[PDB]
Scaffold this motif. Structure first.
Motif, mmCIF file in Angstrom:
data_model
loop_
_atom_site.group_PDB
_atom_site.id
_atom_site.type_symbol
_atom_site.label_atom_id
_atom_site.label_comp_id
_atom_site.label_asym_id
_atom_site.label_seq_id
_atom_site.Cartn_x
_atom_site.Cartn_y
_atom_site.Cartn_z
ATOM 1 N N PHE A 57 0.840 -1.198 0.000
ATOM 2 C CA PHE A 57 0.000 0.000 0.000
ATOM 3 C C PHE A 57 0.883 1.259 0.000
ATOM 4 C CE2 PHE A 57 -2.718 3.284 1.974
ATOM 5 C CZ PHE A 57 -3.710 3.318 1.030
ATOM 6 N N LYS A 58 0.780 2.061 -1.056
ATOM 7 C CA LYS A 58 1.599 3.262 -1.224
ATOM 8 C C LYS A 58 0.768 4.498 -0.935
ATOM 9 C CE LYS A 58 5.062 2.328 -4.683
ATOM 10 N NZ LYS A 58 5.749 3.398 -5.486
ATOM 11 N N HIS A 59 1.319 5.412 -0.139
ATOM 12 C CA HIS A 59 0.660 6.689 0.160
ATOM 13 C C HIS A 59 1.564 7.841 -0.258
ATOM 14 C CE1 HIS A 59 -0.932 10.072 2.629
ATOM 15 N NE2 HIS A 59 -2.081 9.526 2.274
ATOM 16 N N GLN A 114 0.081 5.678 -13.882
ATOM 17 C CA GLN A 114 0.955 5.259 -14.990
ATOM 18 C C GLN A 114 1.299 3.773 -14.831
ATOM 19 O OE1 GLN A 114 3.541 7.980 -17.172
ATOM 20 N NE2 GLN A 114 5.365 6.789 -16.537
ATOM 21 N N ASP A 115 1.677 3.367 -13.627
ATOM 22 C CA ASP A 115 1.872 1.934 -13.365
ATOM 23 C C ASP A 115 0.603 1.086 -13.547
ATOM 24 O OD1 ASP A 115 4.478 3.058 -12.130
ATOM 25 O OD2 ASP A 115 4.728 0.892 -11.908
ATOM 26 N N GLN A 116 -0.547 1.622 -13.152
ATOM 27 C CA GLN A 116 -1.818 0.951 -13.345
ATOM 28 C C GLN A 116 -2.121 0.726 -14.826
ATOM 29 O OE1 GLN A 116 -5.890 1.553 -11.180
ATOM 30 N NE2 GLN A 116 -5.714 3.187 -12.696
ATOM 31 N N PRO A 157 1.734 -10.309 -14.719
ATOM 32 C CA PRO A 157 0.945 -9.078 -14.739
ATOM 33 C C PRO A 157 0.290 -8.844 -13.378
ATOM 34 C CG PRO A 157 -0.200 -10.796 -15.933
ATOM 35 C CD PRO A 157 0.967 -11.447 -15.244
ATOM 36 N N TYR A 158 1.106 -8.430 -12.421
ATOM 37 C CA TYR A 158 0.632 -8.218 -11.066
ATOM 38 C C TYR A 158 -0.375 -7.083 -10.995
ATOM 39 C CZ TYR A 158 4.265 -4.598 -11.010
ATOM 40 O OH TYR A 158 5.023 -3.480 -11.267
ATOM 41 N N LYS A 159 -1.278 -7.178 -10.028
ATOM 42 C CA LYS A 159 -2.377 -6.239 -9.971
ATOM 43 C C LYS A 159 -1.897 -4.919 -9.382
ATOM 44 C CE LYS A 159 -5.680 -9.194 -11.317
ATOM 45 N NZ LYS A 159 -4.906 -10.461 -11.269
ATOM 46 N N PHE A 212 -2.903 0.370 -4.218
ATOM 47 C CA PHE A 212 -2.360 -0.952 -3.912
ATOM 48 C C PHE A 212 -1.563 -1.558 -5.063
ATOM 49 C CE2 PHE A 212 -6.180 -0.567 -1.361
ATOM 50 C CZ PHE A 212 -5.770 -1.047 -0.140
ATOM 51 N N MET A 213 -0.624 -2.428 -4.715
ATOM 52 C CA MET A 213 -0.019 -3.335 -5.670
ATOM 53 C C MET A 213 0.117 -4.725 -5.065
ATOM 54 S SD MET A 213 3.017 -1.115 -7.268
ATOM 55 C CE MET A 213 2.621 0.280 -8.336
ATOM 56 N N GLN A 214 -0.061 -5.724 -5.914
ATOM 57 C CA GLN A 214 0.068 -7.106 -5.525
ATOM 58 C C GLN A 214 1.547 -7.408 -5.274
ATOM 59 O OE1 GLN A 214 -1.197 -9.831 -8.593
ATOM 60 N NE2 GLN A 214 -1.063 -11.637 -7.259
ATOM 61 N N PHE A 215 1.860 -7.949 -4.104
ATOM 62 C CA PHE A 215 3.217 -8.369 -3.797
ATOM 63 C C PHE A 215 3.441 -9.782 -4.319
ATOM 64 C CE2 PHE A 215 6.674 -10.218 -1.377
ATOM 65 C CZ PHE A 215 7.606 -9.195 -1.351
ATOM 66 N N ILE A 216 4.360 -9.912 -5.274
ATOM 67 C CA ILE A 216 4.799 -11.198 -5.816
ATOM 68 C C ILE A 216 6.101 -11.640 -5.138
ATOM 69 C CG2 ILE A 216 5.538 -12.459 -7.874
ATOM 70 C CD1 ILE A 216 2.676 -11.593 -8.065
ATOM 71 N N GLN A 217 6.107 -12.849 -4.583
ATOM 72 C CA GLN A 217 7.309 -13.394 -3.976
ATOM 73 C C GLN A 217 8.378 -13.584 -5.051
ATOM 74 O OE1 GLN A 217 7.378 -16.905 -0.992
ATOM 75 N NE2 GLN A 217 8.715 -17.604 -2.668
ATOM 76 N N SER A 218 9.537 -12.994 -4.809
ATOM 77 C CA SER A 218 10.544 -12.793 -5.830
ATOM 78 C C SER A 218 11.765 -12.118 -5.216
ATOM 79 C CB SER A 218 9.989 -11.910 -6.967
ATOM 80 O OG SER A 218 9.478 -10.670 -6.478
ATOM 81 N N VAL A 219 12.862 -12.113 -5.970
ATOM 82 C CA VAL A 219 14.095 -11.447 -5.572
ATOM 83 C C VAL A 219 14.544 -10.521 -6.712
ATOM 84 C CG1 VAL A 219 16.378 -11.765 -4.585
ATOM 85 C CG2 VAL A 219 14.722 -13.597 -4.392
ATOM 86 N N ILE A 240 9.189 -4.343 -12.835
ATOM 87 C CA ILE A 240 8.377 -3.475 -11.985
ATOM 88 C C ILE A 240 8.749 -2.001 -12.222
ATOM 89 C CG2 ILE A 240 8.101 -5.196 -10.136
ATOM 90 C CD1 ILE A 240 10.249 -3.542 -8.487
ATOM 91 N N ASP A 241 7.899 -1.107 -11.725
ATOM 92 C CA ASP A 241 8.193 0.320 -11.565
ATOM 93 C C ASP A 241 8.321 1.084 -12.871
ATOM 94 O OD1 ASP A 241 8.890 2.917 -10.775
ATOM 95 O OD2 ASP A 241 10.320 2.290 -9.273
ATOM 96 N N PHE A 242 7.180 1.365 -13.486
ATOM 97 C CA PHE A 242 7.131 1.930 -14.827
ATOM 98 C C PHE A 242 6.957 3.459 -14.842
ATOM 99 C CE2 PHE A 242 5.656 -2.472 -14.832
ATOM 100 C CZ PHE A 242 6.554 -3.034 -15.714
#
Ligand SMILES: Oc1cccc(-c2nc(N3CCOCC3)c3sccc3n2)c1
Ligand SMILES: [Cl-]
Ligand SMILES: [Cl-]
Length: 547
Positions: free
Chosen positions: A311-313, A319-321, A345-347, A357-364, A436-438
């Motif tokens: 959750f980003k505030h 743009q990312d959406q 294609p994470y939400k 919001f953004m979906q957290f994908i388990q990843s490195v 990520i991060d467009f």
């Protein structure tokens, strides 16, 4: 006379050329005259219809009335093509209602793929009509009063019959209502979006039990978001270190009588309404180490599972959406052509222009892989070993890696994604690579003259280098993905045409050149064979530079 005309060979060739143009191509007067002249012949061709509607001089009541007569007799155009008719170029109401009649034939799944763009298309509708169909916008859904189709009426009508559509319609429109640039620069447009939300509420309250339950669950979501925003503000206001802020975050979340975020009535997650949530798990919530300190929150689901989000505030996610909505589309189109490239294609969902919001994908992050394990291959060896696999790695994991690399190399090239480094390239233990991060798209970059193909050395080493079989397959998947997406150029361009007036930073810089920046990437001037060699050239030029 004009209705009896049938075109000779030469004229048919010229007409086919015009009909094959992309939807953005301005027809010359000669092209317009020829399409008008052979309008009765062309009534047999669904693809010629959009060309015909661009050849009519609508100022002459003569032609206008005949054009609408022909529109009704024309072989019905495809759903994809109707989206052109909803752009700003068309103001004629009968044309715009025709477009909606075509959308009415779409299934709900397709309708959901286009919805973000359809909500922007409300800007081009008749504002009076929207108003006549009948104020803090976030309180409309939470303040119920006791007890042919235009685009607005259509979307609300479909939202009432589909809770997933209703959810995205609600949140997409609330963000347009909340947009302060629209308030400050285009007051009329701000008003229209308020009126749409008032119509939407009105219809929901008019309906049967089904629809009225939907309305009370949107309200429950809205107030849950409001309460979470209030809690994030409380966390930031409090100076002190990151450990101190986490402690405040977990305490506020653990006080359900005050904030009511840890036990709620199985409400839909705005990010993914199909997931129904009991509440947020207090003891696992923490802040990321970055400027704006967004939070990682685990939602407890109805089945007792956990769904992590970010959750980003204090940040505009739109743009990312938009980019993740288009990646999701591109992934669906490729899968429909029997090509599953294992994309991620994470939400992403903006709940305002200031949060989301953004979906957290388990990843490195690939940078962390390099730091802890040294290479992408060593990482796959450790977490997916296989004695007889390529380079000691599981064939499935390498297959997934090659495909996802190729998929993303073509997708980030089409979308012109910039600012690519090893902290915004992510990797899973199942072999999926993703971006990520467009914040830089459509050719923009923080550096000058950026390479058009965003491939790096550690990606190629992950495939086992330039002389491997994996690398040959990567190339093939790249050019095959490129040819497929080119076949859908019309849909993709039509959708971008509906975004030209959105307050998306990399679009708003040059709204009028936005579609062409996408269109040029498809190289529609080239044949399929030539386009394959152009793509191979893009990969060779990048890989040569890297070594
Ligand atoms: O589309 C944007 C825009 C801005 C930031 C991010 C983003 N996404 C992340 N994700 C999302 C996918 O799940 C894996 C982690 C992570 S992780 C650590 C930082 C981070 N940042 C994504
Ligand atoms: Cl018009
Ligand atoms: Cl964290």
């Amino acid at each position: 006379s004009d209705h009896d005309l049938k075109p000779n060979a030469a004229t048919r060739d010229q007409l086919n050329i015009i009909v094959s143009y992309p939807p953005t191509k301005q027809l010359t007067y000669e092209e317009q005259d020829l399409v008008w002249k052979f309008r009765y012949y062309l009534t047999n061709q669904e693809k010629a219809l959009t060309k015909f509607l661009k050849c009519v001089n609508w100022d002459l009541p003569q032609e206008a009335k005949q054009a609408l007569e022909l529109l009704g007799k024309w072989k019905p155009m495809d759903v994809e093509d109707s989206l052109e008719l909803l752009s700003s170029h068309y103001t004629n109401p009968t044309v715009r209602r025709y477009a909606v009649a075509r959308l009415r034939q779409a299934d709900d799944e397709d309708l959901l793929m286009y919805l973000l763009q359809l909500v922007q298309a409300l800007k081009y509708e008749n504002f009076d009509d929207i108003k006549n169909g009948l104020i803090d916008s976030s309180q409309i859904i939470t303040s119920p009063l006791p007890s042919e189709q235009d685009l607005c009426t259509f979307l609300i009508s479909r939202a009432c019959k589909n809770s997933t559509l209703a959810n995205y319609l609600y949140w997409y429109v609330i963000v347009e209502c909340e947009d302060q640039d629209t308030q400050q620069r285009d007051p009329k447009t701000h008003e229209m979006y308020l009126n749409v939300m008032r119509r939407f509420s009105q219809a929901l309250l008019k309906g049967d039990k089904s629809v009225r339950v939907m309305r009370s669950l949107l309200a429950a979501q809205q107030t849950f978001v409001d309460r979470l925003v209030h809690l994030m503000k409380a966390v930031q206001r409090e100076s002190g270190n990151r450990k101190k802020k986490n402690e405040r975050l977990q305490a506020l979340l653990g006080d359900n009588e005050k904030m009511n975020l840890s036990d709620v009535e199985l409400i839909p997650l705005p990010l993914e309404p199909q997931v129904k949530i009991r509440g947020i798990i207090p003891e696992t919530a923490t802040l990321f180490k970055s400027a704006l300190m967004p939070a990682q929150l685990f939602f407890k689901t109805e089945d007792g599972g956990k769904y992590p989000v970010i959750f980003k505030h204090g940040d505009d996610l739109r743009q990312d959406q938009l980019i993740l909505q288009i990646i999701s589309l591109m992934d669906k189109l490729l899968r429909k052509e029997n090509l599953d490239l294992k994309l991620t294609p994470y939400k992403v969902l903006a709940t305002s222009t200031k949060h989301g919001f953004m979906q957290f994908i388990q990843s490195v992050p690939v940078a962390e892989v390099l730091d802890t394990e040294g290479s992408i291959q060593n990482f796959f060896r450790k977490y997916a070993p296989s004695e007889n696999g390529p380079n000691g790695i599981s064939a499935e994991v390498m297959d997934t890696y090659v495909k996802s690399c190729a998929g993303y190399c073509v997708i980030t090239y089409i979308l012109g994604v910039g600012d690519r480094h090893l902290d915004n390239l992510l990797l899973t233990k199942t072999g999926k690579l993703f971006h990520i991060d467009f914040g830089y798209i459509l050719g923009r970059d923080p550096k000058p003259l950026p390479p058009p193909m965003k491939l790096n050395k550690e990606m190629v080493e992950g495939m086992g280098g330039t002389q491997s079989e994996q690398y040959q397959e990567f190339r093939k998947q790249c050019y095959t993905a490129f040819l497929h997406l080119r076949r859908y150029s019309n849909l993709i361009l039509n959708l971008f045409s509906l975004m030209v007036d959105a307050n998306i930073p990399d679009i708003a810089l040059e709204p009028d050149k936005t579609v062409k920046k996408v269109q040029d990437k498809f190289r529609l001037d080239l044949s399929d064979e030539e386009a394959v060699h152009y793509m191979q050239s893009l990969i060779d030029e990048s890989v040569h530079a890297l070594f």
